[PDB]
């Protein structure tokens with residue numbers, strides 16, 4: 001296609017063909033008849049009105065079924081010239097099925113990205129597409145969102161152009177459920193900035209390879225997504241004043257550290273454990289005293305060890321190379337396989353009660369002997385200190401007799417803690433390689449928090465993930481719907497505050513505040529006699545009937561026992577409260593940690609060096625640190641939509657996507673663009689950029705007030721004076737009018753350039 005020639009082989013997946021762009025205007029269409037009507041098994045269906053029956057209406061659906069629906073509920077189709085429109089704000093009719101059927105029609109030819117005014121909607125295709133080839137990065141460079149079709153490269157590029165123009169730090173905030181596409185879209189953003197910087201060192205590649213290193217240790221197969229990324233990641237890319245790639249920093253906010261020892265059915269451990277095994281690689285499995293079968297490792301065997309989607313034998317080589325490119329030295333790279341090897345043995349250690357003494361001692365020794373060799377420990381001191389911890393009580397240490405159940409837990413607590421400290425060290429190792437010391441002024445922070453989750457055993461590790469979602473949407477709701485309406489009244493626009501009905505602070509108050517759920521877990525760590533049944537009672541007495549979002553559990557038949565239900569923004573989640581009081585503090589055996597501090601292995605001695613602050617406190621403070629930082633940046637949202645739970649491509653379930661569109665607030669997010677004034681410019685820059693349009697309206701060199709100058713200027717530009725407004729400090733524009741000025745600006749400049757050529761011929 002001629003216009004699409006710059007996008008190459010990706011062009012059929014970025015615009016409809018030059019045939020269809022014309023042929024769609026030929027479609028049969030009666031505006032009086034083409035409507036959407038509601039239906040139960042599929043949220044809306046296209047229909048033709050058959051008759052009017054006063055305040056009722058009768059219609060024939062697209063599937064030929066007759067329907068009768070009330071006239072306030074039947075709702076017009078968008079007319080066919082708007083089919084597959086690239087920026088849905090410009091629809092003639094905007095409503096629930098309009099955004100639904102437009103997204104289905106773009107997805108119905110695998111055009112996946114779509115704009116929604118100030119943000120984007122990304123449906124997930126479970127099929128790889130050529131739309132990410134590296135020549136398309138060059139085709140996207142420097143274009144406006146009004147020119148090029150919607151794509152993740154366009155949003156990064158628009159964010160980059162805004163950075164250079166307004167001199168303010170950008171953030172790209174990618175949001176959606178588990179399985180929606182947040183990780184790959186983060187990778188594509190990082191891919192764009194890498195390839196741009198590589199056309200114009202090795203930093204450009206290191207920031208690509210910094211992902212698959214972490215994806216080995218931080219991602220694990222769960223039923224919602226085979227590559228579900230169990231940690232929230234915020235990548236700050238740093239750029240110099242010239243705009244070149246300078247450096248990058250990774251932050252990683254929480255890890256599901258209990259997955260190392262506990263897995264549900266249909267789930268894996270972290271990928272590093274299974275790709276060590278599956279490649280059969282003798283350079284590891286002779287250094288680590290492993291045997292090639294996962295099923296005898298008690299930490300790893302439960303759940304599912306293998307999946308059709310992932311070829312671990314190649315993924316191991318990819319991540320072993322990824323540590324090479326990041327510069328991990330060979331002894332250091334081998335060393336972290338040793339701990340990831342030791343953790344497999346560490347769960348196989350058997351312990352037995354002495355028959356009258358009610359104290360546990362090691363049933364065997366060989367699996368402890370393997371672990372102590374890898375961790376660089378004395379096996380005799382390891383098993384002694386594990387079964388006989390010395391706890392300091394002032395002047396004396398008392399020795400506690402561990403029963404067989406609690407010594408098993410103590411191994412689990414140690415295994416978790418080694419893994420989480422090794423992972424968090426690796427991020428600190430990556431950041432130290434990436435700090436290139438190139439000159440710097442601005443940053444672009446790309447965020448993919450762990451997506452909203454509903455498993456069937458919603459333990460504490462899903463409250464922290466679902467609370468993070470509820471804050472980040474409340475960041476979106478604050479930015480798009482409240483701050484966008486505080487600015488209007490502050491600048492004195494003739495505006496009336498609109499109640500969009502999208503606000504969540506009533507539910508965050510149930511979690512974050514000092515008598516919310518995550519505050520009771522901080523009080524009950526102070527009491528030695530607290531227990532989870534007493535904790536659960538303290539919740540109900542404080543919150544049942546004293547908040548709307550806190551409800552009694554709805555135990556369905558089959559589903560495990562659950563102890564309450566929360567009304568989170570995207571669904572009713574039935575948490576299980578067993579064991580949260582240890583999970584919120586998780587204390588280590590102080591003596592065995594003293595052995596890790598005396599390990600010969602330089603890594604493990606570093607991991608526990610300089611080992612009061614709960615898991616929730618450190619989380620909540622870090623999360624409020626994150627969203628303090630984001631408020632000092634201009635956010636670009638990209639919404640991600642999971643179209644199908646079956647993971648089959650192209651088929652879309654209408655109720656499931658409609659639930660996501662509503663709770664992401666996508667419909668309100670477009671309405672504020674059509675109602676409000678999304679583009680706004682300071683009068684100083686308005687004089688500076690746009691006086692070219694009509695220089696005679698305000699002659700520089702003759703003084704005029706910059707406000708009064710703009711007021712004269714726009715009146716002379718033969719444009720509709722209802723589309724713009726004058727505030728105290730800024731001019732404000734309706735949705736399309738900024739584009740109209742840009743088009744008029746380039747047209748006049750081009751004419752001037754032709755006059756420059758013509759005068760040159762004239763003087764010669």
Ligand SMILES: Nc1ncnc2c1ncn2[C@@H]1O[C@H](COP(=O)(O)OP(=O)(O)O)[C@@H](O)[C@H]1O
Pocket residue numbers: 124125126127128129177178179180181182183184185225226227228229451
């Ligand atoms: N843009 C895309 N192109 C092709 N396949 C995709 C895309 N996005 C998601 N998928 C499919 O869905 C899976 C989940 O994507 P993932 O990167 O794990 O996102 P998330 O971390 O949000 O679950 C991918 O492994 C792939 O199977």
Ligand SMILES: [Mg+2]
Pocket residue numbers: 182183228229448449450451
């Ligand atoms: Mg992810």
